[PDB]
Amino acid sequence: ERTLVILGATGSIGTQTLDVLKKVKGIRLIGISFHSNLELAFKIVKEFNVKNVAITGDVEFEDSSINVWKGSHSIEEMLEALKPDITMVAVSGFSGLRAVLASLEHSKRVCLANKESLVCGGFLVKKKLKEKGTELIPVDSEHSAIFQVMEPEVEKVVLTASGGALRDWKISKIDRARPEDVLARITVDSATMVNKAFEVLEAMELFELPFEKIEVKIHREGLVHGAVVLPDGNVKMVVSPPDMRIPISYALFYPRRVALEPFFLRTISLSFEDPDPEKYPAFFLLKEIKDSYALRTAFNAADEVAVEAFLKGRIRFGGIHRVIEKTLEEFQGYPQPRTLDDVERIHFEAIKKAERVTEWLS
Template structure:
């Protein structure tokens, strides 16, 4: 009985996505962790396989697996299983809602849902502090900075791959199709995040995440391209020391660290020094205009309303692009117009309910702008 009490109970929210399935891979290798519940969207076959392999009894979905106990929502599941760790890997605004709920029922959030801090960072941090919940980042860049962090930081640097557009001549970028954009040069990820890597909206999210996680001003957060994705993060200390976190691009490593912190229990291949690629290059404004538009917005005003609009519009625009309704260039148009519309209203966010309402409003605007682009 004594040994059983040391088992960490884990719930994976978004279990059939890229981060979810890699979390399953990690837990299969680790001792002392038991997946007690999952949530998933439409991939019943993948969910069934996970539940059979890991002997999971509980799940949340609007689809039937055929065995186990199904709950209608995340709160019901978490109340039932009382997990030690919740892996938040639901993309989009649904992931924000799931994270807010999970904070009420667990001791640690392994956070892969970028949108939670982008759209509701102050509220997420406040609830975590009140409930004594650890937030451990799963993003490779934030995991890197988290591992390097100490109080004497001058600035940090997070890296970007540049996505599928990094070597495409500028004049051809606007004509790229979903099949072109989804060919990520270094990472294996889901559809939206792969597109967001090519617009670098993903990296804009990560700048905001770093600001929220590490309480750093935006002028202390730098972004550079590292083509191999070998460097994940760099911390510059006030005494002149530079600490670099590097390694092969494998999301299982930061996932494992978020689960086992402060220990390292996961085993992976260690790169040879000859594989190191430490070359950093500047991000081109002409190639990634939406990224720089967002940075300019952050310098002008860092309020939640436009950040919520950024996520809502990007989520809808990327889905429209992937389904062939709008062009790659139209993503930028939809996002900018939605942000400008929300920004003009001077919305003040004072509660998590305000976050939800502003998301709904931004989505209605984004949907309208998308329909206009389709009709052109």
């Protein structure tokens, strides 16, 4: 009954969304976008009988049987043509900002699983949300949890974090870590807690929260996905298994609850500790960058470069936060971006500077 477009269908969230569609009825998939993974894309288009494809990268997809949009405006033009009830925005990276803006324009509901859009261009997304009235539901497990318990008056919003792959390591050994010791961008971002820094900025945008009302706790066990501390002593917490199909399903079928597998209650350990500034320096850059979309966009651009460089073996793990920090210095005093073009300009300039810094660090 409800029509769906999945942007970034070939990624993790994209394929987990497909899995949900196999498990629950009522949504018809009518289009996808994907970047370069044609082998998986072909498999999707075959299994789901998808007649509309937007290609965002540099590959071919002939098929006279299906409509194929191609180029820098493929997502936007596909969406205009299809006017889906629901768009799952699961594109990775900075291209997520235009993907989200276009989905808000042409869709009745947007399921948001791209972080860059809010980190770099949250003001643009909020402006478009207000103009269009489109429903927006976060897919991120922590924002999904908060969405389910949020109210207008809160003391604090608590986001939880694993602490990443090196949460147990000594401060002294972390600097030297290799991909082998860490392992995927998301995986590296969890280890530096840059992913958690993105989530704080996203929560500020989604829930109109001041920076001061957000708390991050390392939560070893992975059960509590968010909590809301209220003025009266009450705390509303959300617990679930750590499976992204849960918040995917919630954003897709809201206000209905999909029957998956209930989390029946048993005795549990719930630990909450403050992140160590000496272990997670890039995370603690939040206070420096929060008020500036120029700084936030530069923060994201430098992290993209540094993670890629870390993965390629050009720098050690300790080099990530240093690339970010050094790149941010070069954007101090930048005026607040006002348009999409301003944001895209900062982004590309930040990528250039971060690469220069990465070269120095080796």
